[PDB]
Amino acid sequence: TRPPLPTLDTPSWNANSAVSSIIYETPAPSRQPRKQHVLNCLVQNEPGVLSRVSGTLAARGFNIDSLVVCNTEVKDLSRMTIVLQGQDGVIEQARRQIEDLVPVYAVLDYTNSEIIKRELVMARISLLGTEYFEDLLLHHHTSTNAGAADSQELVAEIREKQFHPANLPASEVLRLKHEHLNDITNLTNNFGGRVVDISETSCIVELSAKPTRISAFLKLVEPFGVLECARSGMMALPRTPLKTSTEEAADE
Amino acid sequence: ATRPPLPTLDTPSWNANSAVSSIIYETPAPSRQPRKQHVLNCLVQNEPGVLSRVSGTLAARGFNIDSLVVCNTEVKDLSRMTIVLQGQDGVIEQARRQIEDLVPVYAVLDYTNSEIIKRELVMARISLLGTEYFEDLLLHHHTSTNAGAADSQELVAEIREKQFHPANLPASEVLRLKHEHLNDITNLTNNFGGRVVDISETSCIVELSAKPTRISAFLKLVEPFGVLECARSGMMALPRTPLKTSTEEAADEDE
Amino acid sequence: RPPLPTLDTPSWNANSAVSSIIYETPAPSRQPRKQHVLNCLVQNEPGVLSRVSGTLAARGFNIDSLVVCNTEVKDLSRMTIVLQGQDGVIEQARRQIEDLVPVYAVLDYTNSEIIKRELVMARISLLGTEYFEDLLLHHHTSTNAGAADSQELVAEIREKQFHPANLPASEVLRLKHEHLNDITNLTNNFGGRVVDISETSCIVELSAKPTRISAFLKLVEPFGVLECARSGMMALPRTPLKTSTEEAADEDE
Amino acid sequence: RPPLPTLDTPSWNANSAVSSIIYETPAPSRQPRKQHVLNCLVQNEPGVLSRVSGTLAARGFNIDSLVVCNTEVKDLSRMTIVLQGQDGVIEQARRQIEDLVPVYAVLDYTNSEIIKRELVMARISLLGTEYFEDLLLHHHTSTNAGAADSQELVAEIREKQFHPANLPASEVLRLKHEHLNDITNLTNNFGGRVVDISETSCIVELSAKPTRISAFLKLVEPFGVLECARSGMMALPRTPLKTSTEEAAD
Amino acid sequence: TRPPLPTLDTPSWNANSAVSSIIYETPRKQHVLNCLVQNEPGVLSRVSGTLAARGFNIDSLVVCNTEVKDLSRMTIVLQGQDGVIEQARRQIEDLVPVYAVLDYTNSEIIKRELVMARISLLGTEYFEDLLLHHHTGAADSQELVAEIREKQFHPANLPASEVLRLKHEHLNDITNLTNNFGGRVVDISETSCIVELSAKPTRISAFLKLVEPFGVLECARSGMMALPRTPLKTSTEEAADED
Amino acid sequence: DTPSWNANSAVSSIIYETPAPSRQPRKQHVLNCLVQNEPGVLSRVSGTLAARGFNIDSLVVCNTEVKDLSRMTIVLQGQDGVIEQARRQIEDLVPVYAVLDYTNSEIIKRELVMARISLLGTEYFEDLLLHHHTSTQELVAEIREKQFHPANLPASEVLRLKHEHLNDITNLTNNFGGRVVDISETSCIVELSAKPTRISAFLKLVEPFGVLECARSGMMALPRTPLKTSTEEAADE
Amino acid sequence: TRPPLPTLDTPSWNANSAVSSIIYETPAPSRQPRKQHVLNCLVQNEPGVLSRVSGTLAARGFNIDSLVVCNTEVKDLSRMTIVLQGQDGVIEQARRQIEDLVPVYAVLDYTNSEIIKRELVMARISLLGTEYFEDLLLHHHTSTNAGAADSQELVAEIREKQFHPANLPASEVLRLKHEHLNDITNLTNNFGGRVVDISETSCIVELSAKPTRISAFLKLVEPFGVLECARSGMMALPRTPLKTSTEEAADED
Numbered sequence A: 001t002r003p004p005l006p007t008l009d010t011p012s013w014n015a016n017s018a019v020s021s022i023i024y025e026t027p028a029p030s031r032q033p034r035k036q037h038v039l040n041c042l043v044q045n046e047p048g049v050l051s052r053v054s055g056t057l058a059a060r061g062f063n064i065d066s067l068v069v070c071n072t073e074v075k076d077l078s079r080m081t082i083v084l085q086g087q088d089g090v091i092e093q094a095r096r097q098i099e100d101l102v103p104v105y106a107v108l109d110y111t112n113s114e115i116i117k118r119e120l121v122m123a124r125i126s127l128l129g130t131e132y133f134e135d136l137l138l139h140h141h142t143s144t145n146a147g148a149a150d151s152q153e154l155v156a157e158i159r160e161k162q163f164h165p166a167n168l169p170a171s172e173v174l175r176l177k178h179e180h181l182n183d184i185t186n187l188t189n190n191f192g193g194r195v196v197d198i199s200e201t202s203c204i205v206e207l208s209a210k211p212t213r214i215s216a217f218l219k220l221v222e223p224f225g226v227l228e229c230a231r232s233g234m235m236a237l238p239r240t241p242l243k244t245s246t247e248e249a250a251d252e
Numbered sequence B: 001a002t003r004p005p006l007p008t009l010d011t012p013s014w015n016a017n018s019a020v021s022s023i024i025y026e027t028p029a030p031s032r033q034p035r036k037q038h039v040l041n042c043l044v045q046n047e048p049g050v051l052s053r054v055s056g057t058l059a060a061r062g063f064n065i066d067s068l069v070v071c072n073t074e075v076k077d078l079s080r081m082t083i084v085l086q087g088q089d090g091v092i093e094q095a096r097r098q099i100e101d102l103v104p105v106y107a108v109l110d111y112t113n114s115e116i117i118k119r120e121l122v123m124a125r126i127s128l129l130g131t132e133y134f135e136d137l138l139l140h141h142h143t144s145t146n147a148g149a150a151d152s153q154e155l156v157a158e159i160r161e162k163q164f165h166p167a168n169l170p171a172s173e174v175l176r177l178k179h180e181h182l183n184d185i186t187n188l189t190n191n192f193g194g195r196v197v198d199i200s201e202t203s204c205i206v207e208l209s210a211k212p213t214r215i216s217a218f219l220k221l222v223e224p225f226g227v228l229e230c231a232r233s234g235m236m237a238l239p240r241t242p243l244k245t246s247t248e249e250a251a252d253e254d255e
Numbered sequence C: 001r002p003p004l005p006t007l008d009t010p011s012w013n014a015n016s017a018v019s020s021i022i023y024e025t026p027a028p029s030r031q032p033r034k035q036h037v038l039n040c041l042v043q044n045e046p047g048v049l050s051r052v053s054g055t056l057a058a059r060g061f062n063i064d065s066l067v068v069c070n071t072e073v074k075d076l077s078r079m080t081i082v083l084q085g086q087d088g089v090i091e092q093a094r095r096q097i098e099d100l101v102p103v104y105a106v107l108d109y110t111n112s113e114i115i116k117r118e119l120v121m122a123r124i125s126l127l128g129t130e131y132f133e134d135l136l137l138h139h140h141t142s143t144n145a146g147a148a149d150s151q152e153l154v155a156e157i158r159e160k161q162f163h164p165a166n167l168p169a170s171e172v173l174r175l176k177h178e179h180l181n182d183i184t185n186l187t188n189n190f191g192g193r194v195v196d197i198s199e200t201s202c203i204v205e206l207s208a209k210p211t212r213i214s215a216f217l218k219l220v221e222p223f224g225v226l227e228c229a230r231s232g233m234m235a236l237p238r239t240p241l242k243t244s245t246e247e248a249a250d251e252d253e
Numbered sequence D: 001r002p003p004l005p006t007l008d009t010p011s012w013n014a015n016s017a018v019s020s021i022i023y024e025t026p027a028p029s030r031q032p033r034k035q036h037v038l039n040c041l042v043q044n045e046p047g048v049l050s051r052v053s054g055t056l057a058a059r060g061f062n063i064d065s066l067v068v069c070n071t072e073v074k075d076l077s078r079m080t081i082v083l084q085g086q087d088g089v090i091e092q093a094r095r096q097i098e099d100l101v102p103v104y105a106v107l108d109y110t111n112s113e114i115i116k117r118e119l120v121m122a123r124i125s126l127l128g129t130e131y132f133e134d135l136l137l138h139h140h141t142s143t144n145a146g147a148a149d150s151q152e153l154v155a156e157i158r159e160k161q162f163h164p165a166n167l168p169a170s171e172v173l174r175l176k177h178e179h180l181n182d183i184t185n186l187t188n189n190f191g192g193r194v195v196d197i198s199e200t201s202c203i204v205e206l207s208a209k210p211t212r213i214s215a216f217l218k219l220v221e222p223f224g225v226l227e228c229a230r231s232g233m234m235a236l237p238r239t240p241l242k243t244s245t246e247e248a249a250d
Numbered sequence E: 001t002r003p004p005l006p007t008l009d010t011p012s013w014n015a016n017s018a019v020s021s022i023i024y025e026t027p028r029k030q031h032v033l034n035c036l037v038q039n040e041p042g043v044l045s046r047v048s049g050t051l052a053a054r055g056f057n058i059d060s061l062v063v064c065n066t067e068v069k070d071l072s073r074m075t076i077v078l079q080g081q082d083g084v085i086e087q088a089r090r091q092i093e094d095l096v097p098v099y100a101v102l103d104y105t106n107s108e109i110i111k112r113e114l115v116m117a118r119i120s121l122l123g124t125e126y127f128e129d130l131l132l133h134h135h136t137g138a139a140d141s142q143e144l145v146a147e148i149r150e151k152q153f154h155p156a157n158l159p160a161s162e163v164l165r166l167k168h169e170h171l172n173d174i175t176n177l178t179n180n181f182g183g184r185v186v187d188i189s190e191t192s193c194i195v196e197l198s199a200k201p202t203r204i205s206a207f208l209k210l211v212e213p214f215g216v217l218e219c220a221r222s223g224m225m226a227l228p229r230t231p232l233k234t235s236t237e238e239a240a241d242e243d
Numbered sequence F: 001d002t003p004s005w006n007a008n009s010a011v012s013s014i015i016y017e018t019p020a021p022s023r024q025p026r027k028q029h030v031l032n033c034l035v036q037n038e039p040g041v042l043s044r045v046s047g048t049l050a051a052r053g054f055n056i057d058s059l060v061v062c063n064t065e066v067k068d069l070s071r072m073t074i075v076l077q078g079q080d081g082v083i084e085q086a087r088r089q090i091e092d093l094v095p096v097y098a099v100l101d102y103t104n105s106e107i108i109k110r111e112l113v114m115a116r117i118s119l120l121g122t123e124y125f126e127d128l129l130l131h132h133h134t135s136t137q138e139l140v141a142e143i144r145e146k147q148f149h150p151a152n153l154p155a156s157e158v159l160r161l162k163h164e165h166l167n168d169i170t171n172l173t174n175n176f177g178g179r180v181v182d183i184s185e186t187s188c189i190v191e192l193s194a195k196p197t198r199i200s201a202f203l204k205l206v207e208p209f210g211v212l213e214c215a216r217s218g219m220m221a222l223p224r225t226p227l228k229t230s231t232e233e234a235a236d237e
Numbered sequence G: 001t002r003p004p005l006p007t008l009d010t011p012s013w014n015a016n017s018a019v020s021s022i023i024y025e026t027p028a029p030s031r032q033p034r035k036q037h038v039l040n041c042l043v044q045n046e047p048g049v050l051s052r053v054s055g056t057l058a059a060r061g062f063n064i065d066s067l068v069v070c071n072t073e074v075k076d077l078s079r080m081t082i083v084l085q086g087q088d089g090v091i092e093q094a095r096r097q098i099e100d101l102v103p104v105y106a107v108l109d110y111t112n113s114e115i116i117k118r119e120l121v122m123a124r125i126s127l128l129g130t131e132y133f134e135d136l137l138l139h140h141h142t143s144t145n146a147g148a149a150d151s152q153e154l155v156a157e158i159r160e161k162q163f164h165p166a167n168l169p170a171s172e173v174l175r176l177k178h179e180h181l182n183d184i185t186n187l188t189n190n191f192g193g194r195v196v197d198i199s200e201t202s203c204i205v206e207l208s209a210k211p212t213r214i215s216a217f218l219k220l221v222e223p224f225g226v227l228e229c230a231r232s233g234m235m236a237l238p239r240t241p242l243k244t245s246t247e248e249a250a251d252e253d
């Protein structure tokens, strides 16, 4: 009798089921027109400049997603990155505005340009698991106005869970703590971030990426439990797009 | 007082006989595969209809082509095609002379019996929910073709009542198993020199570029986790020159 | 025997070594006051950034940085503020903002351990520093009326030894990648990252405390900073973790 | 369709969020006080260490650390002393040290931007908290009394769920490397490294500032620190580089 | 009414029990020769044959090519007193095909040794069961394997989902272990893996003792190679001259 | 202005660079003996091969951490009928369990090289190699007259060249999966373990810097496992 | 025609010349004896206990090389690693002499035992090259022989050398700074150290290793010009030399 080991027996697709899988899982409707426009305002640093442009955009019917003032290491000069939605006619109007303001130099449009979008996020994440996160969340809500009465029936359920620290040994909760810490660390690493702080029950992460990616990280790291988050607005700096000599000289 | 006890493992040791008995037993088999596959490299002038003309010729003569990929060099009106064939030297050489005679081609080189760098690209979406879920997910799409219901209930109920199926696991343990599987796959693709380009709630996408014999081994190791979606290229190559030391090349004993 | 010149590295004397350490001393930072940090917990409503910034502008508050950060909580934001002044002035500034309807509370991070950080993106030329000295003058000539002294100095610059107009194509190429390498290793020592590489420039990315950011830009300055963009300042509080043996501070009683 | 249970993790609201953030605010600053760092440049004469340490001991000075270290210069030594007290007392200490004739001068790196470094080497168990809790009790009853006391402690620590004696050797083997990986991640993150790996323990080294080096030992404390060896603090002044657009306020 | 979090309750040493543990936990030299030999036909059997005829207790003998035409260097490791090793050195040096044999014992050298090992990714129970099979005496051993295949964490007593997770857990443990040492993982299979390590003989032997519980299926240790390094010390240490 | 390849000139360069068959139809035969560690087993395995005229390239006795058991990875050339003959000769020896044939198996070949490489440039190495050559003549002044020779450079240079060379050697060593284990004032020692042909490539690339000492040893072998997917495993018949 | 190349082939060794170099470069066995001894004192923290032990070693003429007080994470317990050279007879006398002290528990002898030796060094290294370093050195060497400025002729030949920054364009001294910096960085990376500070002129390296590697490293960075240096005494923490199941089976009687 040779040393026995159970065959896992991994099932394999056929051409039919494989197609139906790709067909079904592929985002066929995709999304509605999401396209956002970005602007780069070059303003002069005067005692009252931020309130002007930010207030001017508010004076009109403009929806502003983000607006950040960036110092450019030049005396009395600031670069402002504005993110807004709408259509080309409305955006150009907003771009034609602000530029007319005298403390500004120019308002460039990077919407149809190849740029580098970068936000900065810093978040403290719990290492005590999901059960503790529900416990902590319900606690800061049941203090006042969590309905029309108490929530002790809900609290008792969360603390009745299997993987709640109150039901686990000190050695087991320690390993799950470092297991979670590593899981967060590996997510942060793949996204190209850092772990700048490690405490007894939490850790602080730091990540710089485009809004598309920097929010995808927050979704993947959400189940661990975000205790405190801070996400900056979008910074923009146009890169220099390069194409090979063969693909270049496309004079036609 | 006694010292804190420890259950001694005492890992058993080999002896001279059982060790040799193990090595001999674990021996594979020589020449389990026939003659090594042949790799051809076409230098084709980039004019409209070349892909249909070349590939159409091989199909019109019944040549067992394993893979054919056209690569765009950084030269105007010049493309490179890498073809993989099977068969005797006499049949494959004829295939070379048949393609090279075509008008829009410059020359068809034979890369077999030559030191080359074979490369291939694969991108695969891998499930993080585990083995049990993959059995459920795959069998679910099979019922869209099998047109069976009452008979398949014996299978799906058997699967969903397994221990490590997500339905039977708490939400906190499924989360850990997702990242445990993720860390396993990530460590697995890193050893192969690959990347993890996408991470989701339920799956991840790995990217790897290596020789076919390397990728197939990779896709076999990742297979138990459950490959939801795969894209594997043909095969391209670039000739290598085997360097030898001045002492080794000085051995010109051609007497 | 095959000869090689002894470089003969001289050693310090006990007095000469002490003399240098003292001469290179000090660079003291006995500042009149630190940089006070405030953190406003703010409800999201139309024209709320104009309110906080406007209130600080209406009064004689010398603020340095004001950046609004978004939490993953619906209708909730953070405003990390950095300003100058004394304890009495800024505490009054804290109560000024806190009385505003949209805000919930304004915390003070001045006397607390926080993680100061700001993002910075810079475009740096890979060509010589003399090329940057030429490019600098060219855009200034496009500002100040008339060339005049421009043609007198541009001749002095363009005749320097390591100007890309006085070197073969292979030399400048090897100089661009050498400059590129020197920059990449600078942004590697710092927690940075090179995100773009052009034919005559490159873009670096760095996120750290304003101390390192200011230090980093000072180091890449000689190469020639074409563009720059520094964030305000973000902050997250951290609690100083002390050992169990260091609970003797509790035994101090 | 496959089941797959949901992970409806609760979301913060405006009220509960600001309530938690406010709750996590300190006093702040009740204890202790600011530390002073001094740097002595002394002649390497026989008995200098006895002079300086003896001087600070004879006086009413509470020194935290004192580190002698060579400087690759003949008969020249450098010492880094960490003080405790008001600025007046510290300066009084500095002058009394400098007044000694084997020392050239004594610098004050307190208000200066310096690089603080301290070395640590600790052997950390891999058998978990239960075994470490057992290990301490065995060595404590070997110095306290020869009687068979604390019977309901050794019996309580043992027969615990994750004590090695209650696990198969397979799990203990994995737990060793599981703990090892956790510790290794701490060291790699803190900028340290593992220099030794035994069957039931490992030795890690770490060179960082005193504040950072203490936070590390607190994180690796629950794993069980068998031996430890924290160096004293070394200090070297750096050259701070503010940007070129600072100009002047007045 | 705040979320319950059980304290670790981690105990701490006192001054007495600490030093008590330190006291309790407180506890021949090899000779290395390097022969410079002209690569004559059948010279390995000439040197090794000499060491056997004279009755020496040599540990290793690895022949290395110096990348020079008709020149090889042999690193020989042997134990014994300083007197008997000099005899072994002189005995070899007298051989015609050898140039000179150097004594690398009293010198700071870089001792190296290559090891390739195949380690099972399955549990230690499977390894304990696998050895019994190849050792198989099938009469009384039928009861022994019963005590083995009964144990949990044996692949036969676990779902394939967990076994798969155990394979990679052990794999990551071996990988993290071989990464601390100057090693690497070369081959990964669905049952085992192959590691490669090169360091001083003490490190290899230490590494194999650590990877031992996982169950080493197949191993291969090279002889000890040696290459002398020159110890560098500072100028103030170089100036420390005594008459 | 950087020039570009022509559609025709590109093809010409490819076929011109494409190497002629620089290898025999025969291949690298690898035999792995499983021997009993008896006194004098090494001398008789070698003796049997040497007395019958077999072109062996290496031997390498390897311990297997099993009591009184060793294994030898023998590499030789010749026809299949000759190698099989050489195999049967060794296996017939009574302290030999079996001699496995790896000449047609997926194996992992490993040589281990340690070499001290000079950092003082090609000029100094050319001088040093000529100095030690004179044993058992106007070139010594011709070499020491060349540019970039240490004696013809300032003290600030050479130091800057030594580390430049050090960086080059390190980058070569890193790419091949090796490491620099020692850094002398005028040289450095590298350590590399890989395929014998990969070692030969490394010792050729690092050759111009000057190889002071070298130790290549021999090749070790351990069988790999050809894993293929479930759709390539179902490619039977 | 054909594309030319400057050289044909690199020269090779022969069996006679190869063994000639190996025998010649093989180190002379001078330091066969003369080993150092490592002691570890488990001491109770009494007021002025350091000056008590160090005073004992000095008063009895013991040749100690380093004495470092390490703090354990235990109340009132500190260990001291004493490194001293001498013969076995004298060292044991030193050990027994120290151990006889009241505040010490016991003194262990880590000599002939597998321990982890570790020193910590922080050094400031110039990036301006060799010429500038012997200029800066001679500058603070003016403490002696300042009569009639006799150092002028010694200074003159220094500042008139090719790669002295005063004779180089500022564009080249920049690349020379970073080239030197990368030579130091790739050097300290090899030893397991790290560069923690980079400035306009110099940089600070940090390396923790056994005293042998520390000294070897300082000998390699010495030519670049070490401005400041600080290396602590070694710390000692014994390890456990493991050996395989067939290695430990050397139970021969």
Ligand SMILES: Nc1ncnc2c1ncn2[C@@H]1O[C@H](COP(=O)(O)OP(=O)(O)OP(=O)(O)O)[C@@H](O)[C@H]1O
Pocket (backbone or CB within 6 Å): A190, A191, A192, A212, A213, A216, A217, B196, B197, B198, B199, B200
């Ligand atoms: N679910 C995700 N959403 C967004 N980003 C992800 C996700 N998963 C991983 N990433 C990050 O995306 C990175 C891969 O992007 P990559 O480096 O290849 O740039 P890219 O090819 O230009 O992609 P894109 O064209 O979308 O910008 C991963 O290394 C990882 O850091």
Ligand SMILES: Nc1ncnc2c1ncn2[C@@H]1O[C@H](COP(=O)(O)OP(=O)(O)OP(=O)(O)O)[C@@H](O)[C@H]1O
Pocket (backbone or CB within 6 Å): B191, B192, B193, B213, B214, B217, E185, E186, E187, E188, E189, F107, F108, F194, F195, F198, F224, F225, F226, F227
């Ligand atoms: N089961 C496997 N089959 C094939 N390749 C594997 C397998 N497991 C791992 N690999 C990959 O092979 C790599 C090792 O290949 P290696 O670096 O030795 O190339 P090599 O020296 O040229 O040898 P070979 O000629 O066999 O490819 C591993 O790092 C890993 O990335």
Ligand SMILES: Nc1ncnc2c1ncn2[C@@H]1O[C@H](COP(=O)(O)OP(=O)(O)OP(=O)(O)O)[C@@H](O)[C@H]1O
Pocket (backbone or CB within 6 Å): C189, C190, C191, C211, C212, C215, C216, D114, D115, D116, D208, D209, D239, D240, D241, G195, G196, G197, G198, G199
């Ligand atoms: N000239 C410089 N000025 C400021 N920071 C620098 C300079 N050069 C390098 N750095 C950065 O300082 C970092 C070292 O700081 P470290 O990681 O040791 O934190 P630290 O021990 O708390 O010291 P600090 O108080 O200065 O922050 C380097 O990794 C490097 O990125």
Ligand SMILES: Nc1ncnc2c1ncn2[C@@H]1O[C@H](COP(=O)(O)OP(=O)(O)OP(=O)(O)O)[C@@H](O)[C@H]1O
Pocket (backbone or CB within 6 Å): A115, A116, A117, A210, A240, A241, A242, C194, C195, C196, C197, C198
């Ligand atoms: N000149 C360049 N052109 C294109 N890509 C570059 C260039 N220089 C660097 N890169 C690559 O871009 C990478 C950084 O972009 P990354 O993909 O990581 O973020 P991203 O925001 O997703 O980029 P993008 O939005 O342009 O797709 C670099 O790591 C580098 O590999």
Ligand SMILES: Nc1ncnc2c1ncn2[C@@H]1O[C@H](COP(=O)(O)OP(=O)(O)OP(=O)(O)O)[C@@H](O)[C@H]1O
Pocket (backbone or CB within 6 Å): A195, A196, A197, A198, A199, C208, C209, C241, D189, D190, D191, D211, D212, D215, D216
């Ligand atoms: N709980 C902790 N306490 C102290 N340091 C930690 C802690 N957790 C992590 N670290 C370390 O802090 C480091 C991050 O600090 P960093 O290198 O950025 O210096 P910094 O920007 O000057 O901040 P700081 O002033 O706190 O030193 C991480 O490398 C991390 O290893």
Ligand SMILES: Nc1ncnc2c1ncn2[C@@H]1O[C@H](COP(=O)(O)OP(=O)(O)OP(=O)(O)O)[C@@H](O)[C@H]1O
Pocket (backbone or CB within 6 Å): D194, D195, D196, D197, D198, E179, E180, E181, E182, E202, E203, E206, E207, G115, G116, G117, G209, G210, G240, G241, G242
């Ligand atoms: N139990 C062990 N036995 C031997 N070597 C180990 C062990 N554990 C780890 N190692 C390896 O030893 C390495 C540390 O070696 P190190 O750099 O300190 O050399 P060293 O300073 O000369 O000290 P030593 O004399 O002990 O070799 C670890 O990085 C690790 O790779």
Ligand SMILES: Nc1ncnc2c1ncn2[C@@H]1O[C@H](COP(=O)(O)OP(=O)(O)OP(=O)(O)O)[C@@H](O)[C@H]1O
Pocket (backbone or CB within 6 Å): E109, E110, E199, E200, E232, F180, F181, F182, F183, F184, G190, G191, G192, G212, G213, G216
């Ligand atoms: N000239 C040198 N002197 C001392 N150490 C050096 C020198 N050059 C490099 N090193 C460092 O020594 C390291 C090699 O140490 P290694 O890992 O081989 O430990 P080891 O096997 O115990 O060697 P040893 O017995 O000599 O201590 C190099 O990686 C490098 O970091």
Ligand SMILES: [Mg+2]
Pocket (backbone or CB within 6 Å): none
């Ligand atoms: Mg810091």
Ligand SMILES: [Mg+2]
Pocket (backbone or CB within 6 Å): none
């Ligand atoms: Mg070592």
Ligand SMILES: [Mg+2]
Pocket (backbone or CB within 6 Å): none
């Ligand atoms: Mg390969």
